[PDB]
């Protein structure tokens, strides 16, 4: 026991891992560490060289101020301005070169690292034991292959380079500010740190508001999950407003937290735009104060102030880059946990023996095993079977007996705790696992063909064989012989291309028989010694089964086969038959020897014989008409927030003019002017604080209101669709839930802080351009020509970063699809021992992809680096032209610096809107999606249409008539379910419908509830076609009890009152359903929460609750769609008692699986091929000795 539990856990145990940047960068080998080192050096250099514009700008400001005061001649002014302009040009060239190299090398390093990670992950997954792989499923592996490697790239991509660059920019800016002027640098740093630590509660408030909103929608998404999954019940009982209200009570909490988010974001914006203005004001004021004792200068004051603001305002890009780094370190932890986990079986290694001249004899001895998923159920107990070369065993039994476990043990998919399996006398636990899998040939129930030619598909079976490395000409002969031995040449030679025809997602689309015949050829081409047929023909049809069975019989006549069959008629010629029940060999023997024994095999063959006998702005603007009271003041607020910066420009120009001292004699006047202008600078820096607070608050409130409206209307629109909408493949529950989660949240990109920043940006740019033209027309025209350049650079930087982000996922699609295809089926790949070939092909593919992507990245990085280097060139040109104008007398120091601050610096602040450009693509795709969703309507079955006759309850009888009803499910329209059905149910009749699987009796409920409309026919209620009746009232007439009871989350009172057409009736119906006593037994009364398995009541109790729910409305037509199919025999008694009690006094249509429920029905209708075959009472159908007799005999035999 301590050993078997250890084995069953070590089979499935999954260790936890913590990945750091060391693990990611350890995939670089040899000369690829120089690439990473050079990338980081270039990033650091290009980040540290950026705050030198502050040095050159301060020097140029000092030169302009000194010349305007007449401290040097024209020639010296020209010389110094030219030299400083060249310094700008050199800085721009250096920024270009280093940005290019840093970005290119970072991207290349990320490509290399992720290629190594992908190779390692695929090599691990392909060699894990099948117990662990079945634990994860395919979804966990396919997701890890496609969207968890992209995150690992982004972690080590140019994002980490930008994070390092930004940290270097902060360090270099602080270093510049301290060296040039530590007195003012220290003062500014202290004040800014005090104003940043003070705004710490606001950041906590924002993060709490985001967490609360995410949690509240998480709860709301759960209500949507149940509503779409349980959509048949909701439509049948009209619980559309109930589920919509449940959703609304949770998407209103998100709006309340969005309010707090609005205040917090407004506070953060106001604090930032107050810190900047207070830093300018304090820098100028305290630099004028210090200057009367240091003679430092406006140049040094500007250098210090600009350096401090530079480093502080570069922090925001660093945070998103570090978020990107940390997101890719969480995925790295998962992938490295899945890589470093060592498998239970060492199938990768070459250890183990290899039997020479393997005859094929197998000898099981006392074999006992458990699956790791369920360590209490024993799926095989004391299995003993000695198989000789050439024999044909045939394991049979009921489902769950454990016949299929033998094949899993022989292929080393799972581990047998106790026993012994000997291949020609050699233990199975001491053999090379891949060799053992090569000696066998697993023909599975579902054939899996890979997207390749038929020749390649059949050649996949040659792995490890002696024919693996031979001439291609010989291989084609072998494939032809194998396809002829498998009865596959008849449809391959008839093909267009023949053996080279593509299959799978390309080329031709085969049938089940043809795919199974190609799988048989693939299995037989290797000349296996053991054949493992695992219900090969269980998934085929009557016509196609013959050819595949002939092929299998031809194959099994020589090899040591182990056939697992569900059609017992195909194994009559087996050399031995083993009957398994609950994991034990109940009896064994030949076909004749077992029939005479009157045993389990006889019952199985009897059952088999009996069965054989049988522009989008205006859209959202119109939707959010109610929020205008918030967006009308926002225009005025944005206009004021826009006048702000072009008045800081005027005051800054006047301050720079006031710093035109010629000696300590002019210091009192300079101090007076600096105080007078710094007062106004601080007053303006406080007005914009309030303006930004109000504007951002109002805009974020509007955005949250729009998101709430989108969610509410989208959920309301999903509930209006007919049942033909929800059974489409693209309207899955998990897809609709995801769409609700994403699109009403992505549409927020066209409102809120983004729209506020858009308005503020355009106003700021327009006001700055107008100010530059008005102050000096000769200087406001040239500097206007640079506004397109600066704005284009600011936009295209973000655009190219988006391009870099998207290339990561766009490039690795072919190889990811190939890997996901070969990982969708691990059992077939592992059976063929195709790990090595798949890994080689995948490794070659991604190695080629690295080189293919490096070139395109090198092409784009040139434009990115040029855009990065443009800015110092614009500065140089502007300063040179300004100096020339100021020499000619056509400009002034005040006018030049006012124009410069406004134009250049205003375009810098308004480029923050371009950081919201990535959202505007999502916010347009989501707008298109929401427009499509909000406009879709059901063709005829509209629950929210008020047209149609109303059913008068006084004259209602309850007569249902299906007149010549023909119906096909629109998802599968080639398979008719009901054909020319004629069925009349008299009022008060307890009609029961019975039949075999696929007869289509359950479609009667769908037609009566009007889930679907019949293609040709007429369903009538009291002589009125239900297509001409009011849908809500009509469905209020009917009631429905389903096979699997569904109870919505909430109290028992809420669930049972879902089917309330209009407190006494509730108690009366709860007593009539034999559930009132159980409810009274509960600690609370009808307030017990049975949601998400809150109390997990018994199936009988949940069915009785559903019966009471259907019974409150007092229906005229009670539909019981196999109510007692999933109930225990003890609870079935009370449930059937409740059903019989409820069936009195109303029309009752009872679809039945167990024929005992329909025993006392007034009329019984037998279904076959969608048409009524027999009809009448129980005794008459028994006397007719027809299909009903066969069904009751089958029920008796099944027991």
Ligand X SMILES: COCC(CCO[C@H]1CC[C@@]2(C)C(=CC[C@H]3[C@@H]4C[C@@H]5O[C@]6(CC[C@@H](C)CO6)[C@@H](C)[C@@H]5[C@@]4(C)CC[C@@H]32)C1)COC
The site that binds ligand X (CB under 6 A) totals a number of residues, namely 12
Choice between 125 and 272, CB closer to ligand X: 272
Spatial CA neighbour of 534 closest among 428, 409, 427, 417: 409
Token pair of 37 as six digits: 């080192």
Q: Does 764 engage in binding with ligand X (CB under 6 A)? A: no
Q: Does 313 engage in binding with ligand X (CB under 6 A)? A: yes
Site map (CB under 6 A) of ligand X, residues 1065-1104, x = contact? ----------------------------------------
Choice between 206 and 307, CB closer to ligand X: 206
Choice between 268 and 531, CB closer to ligand X: 268
Q: Which of residues 911-940 bind ligand X (CB under 6 A)?
A: none
Instruction: Give the residue, chosen from 18, 201, 218, 316, that forms a contact with ligand X under the rule CB under 6 A.
Output: 316
- Contact segment (CB under 6 A) with ligand X among 308-316, 533-541, 576-584, 660-668 equals 308-316
Shortest distance (Å) from residue 767 CB to ligand X: 23
Shortest distance (Å) from residue 183 CB to ligand X: 21
Shortest distance (Å) from residue 107 CB to ligand X: 24
* SS (HEC) of 912-937: CHHHHHHHHHHHHHHHHHHHHHHHCC
Q: Does 607 engage in binding with ligand X (CB under 6 A)? A: no
Q: Does 266 engage in binding with ligand X (CB under 6 A)? A: no
Shortest distance (Å) from residue 84 CB to ligand X: 28
Query: HSE-up of 653 (CA within 13 Å, CB side)?
Result: 23
Residue 469, H or E segment: none
Q: Does 201 engage in binding with ligand X (CB under 6 A)? A: no
Shortest distance (Å) from residue 797 CB to ligand X: 19
In sequence order, the 6+-apart residues with CB closer than 8 A to the CB of 264 are 202, 203, 205, 206, 209
Find out whether 404 is annotated in a ligand binding site. yes
In sequence order, the 6+-apart residues with CB closer than 8 A to the CB of 991 are 985, 1147, 1148, 1149, 1150, 1161, 1162, 1163, 1164, 1165
Shortest distance (Å) from residue 268 CB to ligand X: 6
Token pair of 43 as six digits: 């990033």
Shortest distance (Å) from residue 696 CB to ligand X: 12
- Contact segment (CB under 6 A) with ligand X among 203-211, 454-462, 609-617, 1145-1153 equals 203-211
Choice between 229 and 741, CB closer to ligand X: 741
User: Which residue has tokens 């190609």?
Assistant: 518
* SS (HEC) of 490-538: HHHCCCCCHHHCECCCCCCCCCHHHHHHHHHHHHHHCCCCEEEEECCCC
Instruction: Give the residue, chosen from 292, 315, 683, 1133, that forms a contact with ligand X under the rule CB under 6 A.
Output: 315
- Contact segment (CB under 6 A) with ligand X among 135-143, 299-307, 309-317, 1030-1038 equals 309-317
Q: Does 102 engage in binding with ligand X (CB under 6 A)? A: no
How would you classify the pairing of strands 378-387 and 362-370? Answer: antiparallel
Spatial CA neighbour of 574 closest among 554, 555, 595, 589: 589
Choice between 179 and 193, CB closer to ligand X: 193
Helix axes 472-485, 542-556, angle to 10 degrees: 120
User: Which residue has tokens 């050649």?
Assistant: 459
Choice between 743 and 1121, CB closer to ligand X: 743
Token pair of 365 as six digits: 């001895």
Shortest distance (Å) from residue 99 CB to ligand X: 23
Token pair of 829 as six digits: 């790949």
Shortest distance (Å) from residue 77 CB to ligand X: 35
Choice between 204 and 1133, CB closer to ligand X: 204
For 569-576, which contacts have Cβ atoms below 8 Å and span 24 or more sequence positions?
A: 569/608, 569/612, 570/537, 571/394, 571/396, 573/392, 574/392, 574/393, 574/394, 575/390, 575/391, 575/392, 575/393, 576/391, 576/392, 576/393, 576/394
Choice between 20 and 319, CB closer to ligand X: 319
- Contact segment (CB under 6 A) with ligand X among 287-295, 310-318, 734-742, 1019-1027 equals 310-318
Provide the 3-class DSSP secondary structure of residue 421: strand
Choice between 140 and 912, CB closer to ligand X: 912
Q: Does 319 engage in binding with ligand X (CB under 6 A)? A: yes
Helix axes 52-68, 893-900, angle to 10 degrees: 160
Choice between 205 and 687, CB closer to ligand X: 205
> How would you class 30 by CB atoms within 10 Å of its CB: exposed for 0-12, middle for 13-18, buried for 19 or more?
exposed
- Contact segment (CB under 6 A) with ligand X among 201-209, 346-354, 483-491, 871-879 equals 201-209
How far, in Å, are 379, 563, 1011, 1042 from residue 370 at the CA level? 6, 22, 44, 35
Q: Does 196 engage in binding with ligand X (CB under 6 A)? A: yes
Shortest distance (Å) from residue 1022 CB to ligand X: 58
Choice between 38 and 320, CB closer to ligand X: 320
Instruction: Give the residue, chosen from 27, 38, 41, 203, that forms a contact with ligand X under the rule CB under 6 A.
Output: 203
Instruction: Give the residue, chosen from 56, 160, 177, 275, that forms a contact with ligand X under the rule CB under 6 A.
Output: 275
Site map (CB under 6 A) of ligand X, residues 205-244, x = contact? -xx--x----------------------------------
Shortest distance (Å) from residue 276 CB to ligand X: 6
- Say if CB 461 and CB 505 are below 8 A apart: no
Shortest distance (Å) from residue 89 CB to ligand X: 30
Q: Does 272 engage in binding with ligand X (CB under 6 A)? A: yes
Choice between 210 and 969, CB closer to ligand X: 210
- Say if CB 1182 and CB 1173 are below 8 A apart: no
What is the Cα–Cα distance from 366 to 585, expressed in whole angstroms?
11
Shortest distance (Å) from residue 1166 CB to ligand X: 60
Token pair of 644 as six digits: 């702000």
Report CA dihedral (369, 372, 376, 377) to the nearest 10 degrees: -60
- Contact segment (CB under 6 A) with ligand X among 307-315, 494-502, 1006-1014, 1030-1038 equals 307-315
- Contact segment (CB under 6 A) with ligand X among 199-207, 463-471, 481-489, 1013-1021 equals 199-207
Between vectors from CA 650 to CA 646 and to CA 656, what angle results, nearest 5°?
A: 135
What is the Cα–Cα distance from 829 to 823, expressed in whole angstroms?
8
Q: Alpha-carbon torsion 107, 112, 117, 122, what sign?
A: positive
- Contact segment (CB under 6 A) with ligand X among 200-208, 332-340, 527-535, 619-627 equals 200-208
Spatial CA neighbour of 1110 closest among 1054, 1152, 1061: 1061
- Contact segment (CB under 6 A) with ligand X among 312-320, 784-792, 926-934, 1077-1085 equals 312-320
What is the Cα–Cα distance from 434 to 831, expressed in whole angstroms?
9
Residue 434, H or E segment: helix 433-439
Shortest distance (Å) from residue 353 CB to ligand X: 56
Between vectors from CA 1076 to CA 1075 and to CA 1080, what angle results, nearest 5°?
A: 120
Query: Which residues fall in the annotated binding site?
Result: 404, 534
Query: Which residues fall in the annotated binding site for Mg(2+)?
Result: 404, 534
| Interface residue list for ligand X (CB under 6 A) | 196, 203, 206-207, 210, 272, 275, 312-313, 315-316, 319
């Amino acid at each position: 026991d301590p050993r078997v539990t250890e084995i069953l856990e070590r089979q499935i145990k999954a260790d936890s891992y913590g990945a750091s940047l060391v693990d990611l960068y350890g995939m670089l080998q040899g000369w690829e560490y120089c690439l990473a080192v050079a990338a980081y050096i270039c990033s650091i250099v290009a980040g540290a060289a950026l705050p030198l514009m502050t040095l050159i700008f301060g020097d140029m400001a000092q030169q302009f101020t000194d010349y305007s005061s007449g401290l040097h001649s024209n020639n010296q002014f020209v010389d110094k301005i030219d030299e400083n302009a060249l310094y700008f040009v050199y800085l721009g060239v250096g920024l270009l070169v280093f940005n290019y190299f840093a970005t290119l090398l970072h991207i290349v390093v990320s490509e290399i690292i992720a290629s190594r990670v992908r190779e390692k992950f695929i090599w691990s997954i392909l060699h894990q034991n099948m117990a662990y792989l079945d634990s994860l499923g395919s979804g966990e592996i396919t997701s890890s292959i496609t969207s968890d490697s992209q995150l690992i790239q982004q972690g080590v991509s140019e994002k980490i380079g930008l994070a390092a660059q930004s940290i270097a920019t902060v360090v270099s800016a602080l270093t510049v500010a301290f060296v040039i002027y530590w007195k003012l640098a220290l003062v500014l740093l202290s004040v800014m740190v005090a104003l940043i630590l003070s705004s710490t509660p606001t950041i906590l408030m924002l993060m709490q508001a985001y967490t609360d909103s995410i949690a509240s929608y998480g709860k709301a998404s759960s209500v949507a999950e149940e509503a779409f999954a349980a959509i048949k019940t909701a439509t049948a009982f009209g619980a559309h407003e109930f589920q919509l209200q449940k959703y609304d009570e949770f998407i209103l909490e998100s709006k309340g937290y969005g309010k707090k988010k609005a205040i917090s974001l407004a506070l953060m914006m106001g604090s930032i735009w107050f810190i900047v203005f207070a830093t300018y004001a304090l820098a100028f004021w305290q630099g004028s104060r210090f200057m009367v004792s240091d003679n430092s200068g406006i140049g040094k004051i500007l250098t210090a102030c600009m350096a401090m603001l530079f480093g502080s305002l570069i922090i925001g890009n660093a945070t998103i880059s570090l978020k990107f780094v940390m997101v890719g370190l969480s995925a790295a932890s998962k992938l490295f946990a899945m890589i470093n986990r060592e498998p239970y079986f060492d199938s990768a290694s070459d250890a183990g023996e290899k039997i020479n001249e393997f005859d094929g004899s197998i000898s099981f001895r006392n074999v006992t095993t458990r699956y790791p998923s369920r360590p209490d159920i024993t799926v095989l107990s004391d299995f003993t079977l000695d198989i000789k070369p050439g024999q044909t065993i045939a394991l049979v039994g009921e489902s769950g007996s454990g016949k299929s476990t033998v094949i899993a043990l022989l292929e080393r998919f799972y581990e047998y705790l106790d026993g012994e399996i000997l291949l020609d006398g050699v233990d199975l636990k001491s053999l090379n696992i891949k060799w053992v899998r090569q000696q066998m040939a697993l023909v599975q129930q579902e054939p899996v063909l890979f997207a390749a030619s038929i020749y390649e598909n059949v050649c996949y079976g040659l792995v490890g064989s002696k024919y693996e490395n031979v001439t291609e000409k010989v291989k084609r002969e072998l494939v032809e012989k194998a396809c002829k031995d498998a009865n596959a040449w008849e449809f391959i030679s008839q093909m267009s291309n023949g053996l080279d025809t593509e299959v799978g997602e390309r080329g031709l689309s085969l049938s089940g028989g043809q795919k199974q015949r190609i799988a048989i050829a693939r299995a037989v081409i290797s000349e296996p010694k053991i054949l493992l047929l695992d219900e090969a023909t269980s998934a085929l049809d009557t016509r196609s089964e013959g050819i595949v069975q002939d092929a299998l019989n031809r194959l099994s006549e020589t090899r040591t086969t182990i056939v697992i069959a569900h059609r017992l008629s195909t194994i009559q010629n087996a050399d031995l038959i083993v009957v398994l029940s609950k994991g034990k060999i109940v009896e064994t023997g030949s076909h004749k020897e077992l029939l005479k024994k009157k045993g389990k095999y006889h019952q199985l063959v009897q059952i088999q014989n009996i069965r054989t006998k049988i522009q989008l702005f205006l859209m959202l603007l119109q939707i959010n008409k109610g929020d205008y009271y918030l967006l009308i003041p926002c225009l005025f607020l944005a206009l004021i927030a826009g006048m702000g910066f072009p008045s800081f420009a005027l005051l800054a120009g006047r301050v720079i003019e006031a710093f035109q001292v010629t000696g300590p004699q002019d210091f009192p006047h300079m101090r007076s002017l600096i105080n007078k202008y710094t007062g106004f600078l601080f007053m303006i820096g406080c007005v914009l604080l309030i303006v930004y607070l109000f504007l951002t608050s109002f805009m974020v409130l509007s955005s949250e209101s729009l998101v709430y409206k989108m969610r509410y209307r989208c959920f309301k629109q999903y509930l209006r669709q007919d049942m033909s909408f929800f059974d489409r493949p693209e309207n899955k529950v998990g897809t609709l839930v995801t769409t609700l989660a994403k699109d009403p949240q992505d549409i927020e990109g066209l409102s809120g802080g983004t729209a506020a920043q858009l308005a503020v940006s355009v106003v700021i740019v327009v006001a700055g351009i107008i100010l530059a033209v008005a102050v000096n027309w000769r200087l406001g025209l040239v500097c206007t020509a640079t506004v397109p350049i600066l704005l284009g650079c600011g936009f295209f930087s973000v655009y190219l970063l988006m391009v870099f982000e998207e290339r990561i996922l766009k490039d690795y699609q072919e190889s990811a699809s190939y890997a996901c295809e070969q990982v969708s089926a691990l059992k077939t790949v592992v059976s063929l021992t195709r790990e090595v070939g798949i890994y080689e092909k995948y490794s070659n593919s991604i190695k080629d992809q690295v080189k293919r992507s490096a070139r395109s990245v090198s092409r784009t990085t040139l434009l990115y680096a040029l855009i990065q280097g443009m800015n110092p060139w614009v500065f140089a040109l502007g300063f040179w032209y300004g100096s020339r104008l100021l020499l000619e007398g056509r400009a002034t120091n005040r006018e030049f610096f006012t124009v410069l601050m406004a134009i250049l610096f205003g375009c810098q602040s308004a480029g923050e809107f371009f950081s919201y450009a990535p959202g505007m693509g999502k916010a347009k795709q989501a707008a298109i999606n929401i427009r499509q969703v909000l406009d879709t309507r059901p063709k005829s079955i509209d629950i929210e249409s008020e047209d149609g006759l109303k059913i008068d309850r006084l004259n209602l009888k309850g007569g249902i008539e299906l007149r010549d009803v023909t119906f096909r499910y629109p998802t599968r329209p080639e398979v008719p379910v009901l054909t020319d059905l004629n069925l009349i149910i008299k009022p008060g009749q307890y009609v029961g419908l019975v039949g075999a699987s696929g007869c289509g009796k359950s479609t009667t409920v769908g037609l009566i509830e009007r889930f679907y409309d019949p293609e040709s026919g007429q369903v009538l209620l009291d002589g009125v076609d239900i297509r001409d009746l009011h849908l809500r009232t009509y469905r209020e007439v009917l009631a429905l009890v389903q096979q699997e009871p569904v109870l919505f989350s909430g109290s028992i009172r809420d669930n049972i009152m879902v089917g309330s057409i209009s407190e006494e009736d509730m108690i009366k119906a709860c007593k009539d359903a034999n559930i009132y006593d159980f409810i009274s037994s509960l600690p609370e009364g009808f307030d017990t929460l049975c949601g998400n398995k809150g109390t997990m009541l018994s199936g009988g109790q949940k069915q009785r609750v559903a019966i009471a729910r259907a019974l409150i409305r007092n229906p005229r037509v009670l539909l019981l769609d196999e109510a007692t199919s999933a109930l225990d025999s003890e609870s079935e008694m009370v449930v059937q008692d409740a059903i019989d009690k409820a069936s009195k006094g109303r029309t009752t249509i009872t679809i039945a699986h167990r024929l005992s429920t329909v025993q006392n029905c007034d009329v019984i209708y037998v279904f076959d091929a969608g048409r009524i075959v027999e009809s009448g009472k129980h005794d008459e159908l028994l006397q007719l000795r027809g299909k009903y007799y066969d069904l009751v005999q089958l029920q008796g035999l099944n027991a």
